[PDB]
């Protein structure tokens, strides 16, 4: 432990807490009541990340072999972790860069790395609720867009692509996204998904118009909306024919995989996702509160649900998988019972699935001419719970064609999507304020204009940097960009927190304050997880990331309908100019500690 | 025969555009 020269007559001095919580009436915001502050809490931890990231990880990590890792890390990273930033931002009175600020003036790049990484996360972010309000704006209509196909030029046939592939994929790959067959070539704007975007932007700007105060009320209705909706999915989900057979898929584990890095990267990078850590919002949010406050029961409710809350998700989620393996196989097994009494011409109401096998044996013993030319079809479950599941490919391509089979179909498509538009406004509302925030500490606006001039000039910005997610190869740029900036800048900036709390602020110094405020110490757990364990799980999952970034070939996958063998998944190679991106993406965020650092340190000299 | 996205967008789109000048007056006729 740096015995820190200089650190008091920098933050409050514990008997000036007191006398500072009378004087912020009129400088800081409040909340209104305690309810109005776990609302905002727990909302910005839920919603687009236990239906996209979650899912898509879990079937390649053994099918269902990303519980174990996952909740163990989340234990024993998210807990420690979540824990650290409501207790310092409660005591230091500040944001996420007057924090860090005042432990040492040479650690304010963490408050910029928790800026650029916020502006960058919900770049993309906001770009996956403007395809939601396209599905939203798609329905109120009984025969749903994504339920057949068109016909051609000539009204004879189906196009050629949606004849070959699903009609839901030519409503996504075609008539949303309007695909290319690689990212090096991009075509126009595609003026239908510009107003989206606009009206993405244009919501989220009705609700942050102010900070605080506004987004009250906003957190109020969208987080019940979200919960009360998800409740009304389960009761329909498990009473479909085909689930109880995907949530069996999700619950046995192949413990071959538990031996490999990257099913341990994967696991510790969504705990940080998950729970919106190494963000700089939930330390905003929490330096609202009193002084004494209990900042130990709100970590541990708060926790309690985020993780419930991803299995309750993944139980709806894959009760759906398991209704379209069953709807498949039973078309698929309809395939070679039609097959096979047109063939040999036999009565309908003997050949079934019970005889299948013992009557194909009967037929090559019989003509042995005229069973050569039958084909049979090969498929059997386990080979339809297993797929392309990957990101964008669950609430599009999964959901919207199984609503299409349920009574009442356009019911179930408005609920749905209203949910997801909810569960992804409410995210975005703590994660504007990890961007206006810390640029309002900055001192570059000048402080007599109100606040809802700095809200609208960054959402503008936004939005017009938005415009490479609405061209042809725009659906390229998301995933790459995604994964990248969400993968790599979270676990750098969690390890920075932990470190610099206990080892450059001091654990010592810090249990006096937590005695001071909730009314005694931490327990014998957060002793050891702060200094021992948590610090050295994440040090550890860091050079997993490199195991495994070296020793794989950058893939992506292309649609490219002149491809033989369409409908099935071709992965090329990126261009060479792809590191230019990911560097700037997952770069500036980490060389911004190191960066700031030095500069100060020279300063010194 | 006029796609009822469009219909549905001009509600949605009419509904916010004039929340933001309530909410734009309100803090003025406020502060
Ligand atoms: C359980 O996970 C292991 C680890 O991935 C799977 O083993 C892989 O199987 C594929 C296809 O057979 C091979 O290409 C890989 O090389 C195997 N991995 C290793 C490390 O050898 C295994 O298939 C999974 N279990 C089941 C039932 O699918
Ligand atoms: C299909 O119909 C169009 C008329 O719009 C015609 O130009 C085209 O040649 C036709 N295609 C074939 C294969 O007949
Ligand atoms: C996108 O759609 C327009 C018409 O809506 C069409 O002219 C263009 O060829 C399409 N782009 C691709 C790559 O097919
Ligand atoms: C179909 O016909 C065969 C031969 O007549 C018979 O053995 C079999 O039981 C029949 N299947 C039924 C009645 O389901
Ligand atoms: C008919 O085909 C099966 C395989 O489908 C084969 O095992 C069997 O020997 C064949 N019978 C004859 C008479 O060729
Ligand atoms: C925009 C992000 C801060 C949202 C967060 N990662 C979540 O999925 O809950």
Known sequence: VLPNPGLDARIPSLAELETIEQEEASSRPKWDNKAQYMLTCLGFCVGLGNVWRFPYLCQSHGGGAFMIPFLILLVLEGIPLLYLEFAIGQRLRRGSLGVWSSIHPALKGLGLASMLTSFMVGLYYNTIISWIMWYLFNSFQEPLPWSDCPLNENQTGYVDECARSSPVDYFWYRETLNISTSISDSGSIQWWMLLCLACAWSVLYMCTIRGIETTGKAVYITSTLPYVVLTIFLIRGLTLKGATNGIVFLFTPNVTELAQPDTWLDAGAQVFFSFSLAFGGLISFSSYNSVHNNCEKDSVIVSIINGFTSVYVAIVVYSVIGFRATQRYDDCFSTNILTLINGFDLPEGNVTQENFVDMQQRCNASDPAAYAQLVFQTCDINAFLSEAVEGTGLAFIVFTEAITKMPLSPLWSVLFFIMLFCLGLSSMFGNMEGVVVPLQDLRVIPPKWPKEVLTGLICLGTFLIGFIFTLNSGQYWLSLLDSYAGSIPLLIIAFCEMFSVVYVYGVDRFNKDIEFMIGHKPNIFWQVTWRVVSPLLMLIIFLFFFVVEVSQELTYSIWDPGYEEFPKSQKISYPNWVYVVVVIVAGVPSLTIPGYAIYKLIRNH | ?31
Do not use: E, Q
């Not at chain 2, 469009?6 to 003025?28: E, H, P, Y």
């Open chain 2, 1 to 31: 025969p006029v796609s009822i996205w469009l219909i549905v967008f001009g509600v949605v789109m009419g509904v916010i555009v004039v929340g933001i000048v309530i909410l734009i007056f309100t803090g003025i006729r406020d502060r």
